[PDB]
Design a protein around this ligand. Structure first.
Ligand SMILES: O=C(O)CNC(=O)C(=O)O
Ligand SMILES: [Mg+2]
Ligand code: NI
Ligand SMILES: [Zn+2]
Length: 331
């Protein structure tokens, strides 16, 4: 069995290997990459996402989110308070202000220590989930707006034609902006490209061990767990690496830098934080290997998770027994 310790693997495809996206994902899985839940892909030196980032300041962040924490430094939730619209140029200036800027630090490890010590005492503002793309239309390789759609994959594998669309999303971050512990909708893959700016640190639990994280989360967030049998779908709970180690939860960590891709694999729980002002693009995708994970994915039916239009068909076709309950939670 390849990668039996479930380490995060790093790949360096050549320009020739960068042509066929599906083939390269299958190659990484042949080497055991999916066992970690997360892989890094460094693009060949010949490749670029677009020519420059000099002209992005007029993008609008319609609903910036202030991420307010509750709990203790290593075990907390966050809620999202909506703020007034601002442009990317305005948000960049805000991220660089004395109130929000990255503190002086020695290295990534010192910054990670400072994040976990101090995160709860601040409320950073995140531009999340903005439909759009920063890939040039002429970029033919690993262009996250030109991937094969999940609806087409389901149709190819299973024969059933369904409604829905699959487009990318932009994320504008600052120091301490936080992504809570989660798997993707319907335990899909994700791919994330860091277009510009400061790094993103990731934490990940191997898919084969995801239920260990879920059982800890139920212990640590006992009111939330009574409220919903899949409350990590709410995307609000944080648990630090120190607390995971104290509780014996298998996990790994890695830092993504600008110009790098990360792939999350089906049922790979992940969480993390941004180091300073940055911009990422991400989208969900599927492969044949995903179908069995989609059929078994948990679902939130309590009302909190609320998701895209396109998840309807995935539930309806893959999980018909759960469909009526889940749809009630959507309404
Ligand atoms: O970058 C972020 O805030 C969150 N991204 C992801 O969870 C992802 O790409 O799957
Ligand atoms: Mg612009
Ligand atoms: Ni994700
Ligand atoms: Zn719920």
């Amino acid at each position: 069995a390849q990668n039996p310790n479930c380490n995060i693997m790093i790949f360096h495809p050549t320009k020739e290997e960068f042509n066929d996206f599906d083939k390269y994902i299958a190659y990484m899985e042949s080497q055991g990459a999916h066992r970690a839940g997360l892989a890094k892909i460094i693009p060949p030196k010949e490749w670029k996402a677009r020519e420059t980032y000099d002209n992005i300041s007029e993008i609008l962040i319609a609903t910036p989110l202030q991420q307010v924490a509750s709990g203790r430094a290593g075990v907390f939730t966050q809620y999202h308070k909506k703020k007034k619209a601002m442009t990317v140029g305005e948000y960049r200036h805000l991220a660089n202000s004395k109130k929000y800027q990255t503190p002086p630090h020695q290295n990534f490890e010192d910054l990670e220590r400072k994040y976990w010590k101090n995160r709860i005492y601040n409320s950073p503002i995140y531009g999340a989930d903005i439909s759009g793309s920063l890939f040039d239309e002429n970029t033919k390789q690993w262009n996250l707006g030109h991937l094969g759609t999940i609806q087409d994959l389901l149709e190819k594998e299973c024969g059933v034609v369904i409604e829905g669309v699959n487009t990318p999303y932009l994320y504008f971050g600052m120091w301490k902006t936080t992504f809570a512990w989660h798997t993707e909708d319907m335990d899909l893959y994700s791919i994330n490209y860091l277009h510009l700016g400061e790094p993103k640190t990731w934490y990940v639990v191997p898919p084969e061990h995801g239920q260990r994280l879920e059982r800890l989360a139920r212990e640590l967030f006992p009111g939330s767990s009574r409220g919903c049998g899949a409350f990590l779908r709410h995307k609000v709970a944080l648990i630090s690496p120190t607390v995971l180690k104290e509780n014996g939860i298998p996990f790994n960590r890695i830092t993504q830098e600008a110009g790098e891709f990360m792939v999350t694999f089906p049922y790979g729980y992940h969480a993390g934080f941004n180091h300073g002002f940055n911009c990422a693009e991400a989208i969900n995708f599927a492969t044949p290997r995903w179908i069995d994970y989609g059929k078994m994915a948990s679902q939130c039916s309590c009302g909190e998770a609320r998701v895209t239009f396109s998840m309807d068909a995935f539930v309806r076709i893959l999980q018909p027994e759960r469909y009526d309950l889940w749809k009630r939670g959507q309404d």
